[PDB]
Each structure stands twice: as structure tokens, then as C-alpha cells.
Enzyme design. Structure first.
Site, short mmCIF file in Angstrom:
data_model
loop_
_atom_site.label_atom_id
_atom_site.label_comp_id
_atom_site.label_asym_id
_atom_site.label_seq_id
_atom_site.Cartn_x
_atom_site.Cartn_y
_atom_site.Cartn_z
N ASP A 107 -7.10 7.82 -0.87
CA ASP A 107 -6.56 6.85 0.05
C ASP A 107 -5.53 7.51 0.98
O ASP A 107 -4.73 8.33 0.53
CB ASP A 107 -5.89 5.75 -0.76
CG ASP A 107 -6.85 5.05 -1.70
OD1 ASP A 107 -7.98 4.71 -1.28
OD2 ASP A 107 -6.43 4.78 -2.82
N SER A 144 -12.44 9.89 -4.59
CA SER A 144 -12.03 9.51 -3.25
C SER A 144 -10.52 9.67 -3.13
O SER A 144 -9.82 9.80 -4.12
CB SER A 144 -12.46 8.09 -2.97
OG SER A 144 -11.74 7.15 -3.75
N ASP A 147 -13.10 8.25 -9.05
CA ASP A 147 -14.31 8.34 -8.22
C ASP A 147 -14.26 9.46 -7.20
O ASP A 147 -15.14 9.55 -6.36
CB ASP A 147 -14.68 6.99 -7.58
CG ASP A 147 -13.86 6.67 -6.36
OD1 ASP A 147 -12.80 7.30 -6.15
OD2 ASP A 147 -14.35 5.85 -5.55
N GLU A 196 0.80 -1.21 0.00
CA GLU A 196 0.00 0.00 0.00
C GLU A 196 0.84 1.28 0.00
O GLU A 196 0.53 2.23 -0.74
CB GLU A 196 -0.99 0.02 1.17
CG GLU A 196 -2.10 -1.02 1.05
CD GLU A 196 -3.06 -0.82 -0.13
OE1 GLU A 196 -3.05 0.24 -0.77
OE2 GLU A 196 -3.86 -1.73 -0.39
N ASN A 241 -9.51 4.19 2.34
CA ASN A 241 -10.26 5.02 1.40
C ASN A 241 -11.36 5.86 2.03
O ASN A 241 -12.11 5.39 2.88
CB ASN A 241 -10.85 4.14 0.29
CG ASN A 241 -11.44 4.95 -0.85
OD1 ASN A 241 -12.66 5.15 -0.91
ND2 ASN A 241 -10.60 5.35 -1.79
N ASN A 283 -7.85 9.41 -6.14
CA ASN A 283 -8.44 8.57 -7.17
C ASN A 283 -9.35 9.44 -8.00
O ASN A 283 -10.51 9.68 -7.64
CB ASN A 283 -9.25 7.45 -6.53
CG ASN A 283 -8.40 6.57 -5.64
OD1 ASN A 283 -7.38 6.04 -6.09
ND2 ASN A 283 -8.79 6.44 -4.38
#
Ligand SMILES: [Cl-]
Ligand SMILES: [Cl-]
Ligand SMILES: [Cl-]
Length: 130
Positions: free
Chosen positions: A53, A51, A49, A35, A60, A46
């Protein structure tokens, strides 16, 4: 902060991650490695969409923490996403525990499926005293 491997292993062990809902420490290590490279301060937007992380587990904003700016989002960890960018990972661990209380468990993270699932992950904890 960027953890060293064994320092992180011990840190997660103290926070009760070893075997949480069936998930070995080496699995949590493999997750953090892929990650974030063990980096608490990482964010990744991102664009697809809207969002983001956050932090060492790249948790998220759509489901897990509030950043205010993700449309339609909820906050199941009941934290500001800011909490997931601390050097101290207690809140991030609590939120990771929340994630894996849901049906998918650790499969929630695609990187885990790609990089950890069905693999020999023993190397992540080798020599760490855990
Ligand atoms: Cl396993
Ligand atoms: Cl918070
Ligand atoms: Cl901190």
C-alpha cells in the site's frame, strides 16, 4: 510530507474531491487520516499477498498502481506506485477517483468501513474553510 488537517482539506477541495461520486470531503479526510495519518511517503508491505500500500490513501499495488513486484497485479490507475509517494497529491487524487469509479466506491478501503462509515465525520473539516 505530513499534511496538517485543514491544509489537506483545502488541497483536496481544489483537486475536486468534494462530492466526487457522492463522497463528501470529510469522508476523504477520514480515509486519509486513518490510512496514513495524512502522510504521503508511507508504504506498507502486505506479507500475506505480496502487495504494498502506497501514500496518503494507502492505495494497493495489486489493482491500482504498478510496482513491478506484485504477482498477478494490474494497474488501473496507469501509474507507477512511485507516483503515489509524491508530496504533490494530484496523481494520488486521480487514482483515488479511479478507485471509487468502481462499484464499491469508498468501501474499497476497509479502514473507511472500520473508522468512518456510519460515523459523525464532521470534525475532520471543522474550521478549515471548505
Ligand atoms: Cl456521508
Ligand atoms: Cl508514474
Ligand atoms: Cl513532490
Amino acid at each position: 510530507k505530513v499534511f496538517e488537517r485543514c491544509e489537506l482539506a483545502r488541497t483536496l477541495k481544489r483537486l475536486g474531491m468534494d462530492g466526487y461520486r457522492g463522497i463528501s470531503l470529510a469522508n476523504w479526510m477520514c480515509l486519509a487520516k486513518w490510512e496514513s495519518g495524512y502522510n504521503t511517503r508511507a508504504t506498507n508491505y502486505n506479507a500475506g499477498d505480496r502487495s504494498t500500500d502506497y501514500g496518503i490513501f494507502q492505495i494497493n499495488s495489486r489493482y491500482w498502481c504498478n510496482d513491478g513486484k506484485t504477482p498477478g497485479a494490474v494497474n488501473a490507475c496507469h501509474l507507477s506506485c512511485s507516483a503515489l509517494l509524491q508530496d504533490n497529491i494530484a496523481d494520488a487524487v486521480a487514482c483515488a477517483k479511479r478507485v471509487v469509479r468502481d462499484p464499491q466506491g469508498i468501501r474499497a478501503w476497509v479502514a473507511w468501513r472500520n473508522r468512518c462509515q456510519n460515523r459523525d465525520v464532521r470534525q475532520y473539516v471543522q474550521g478549515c474553510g471548505v
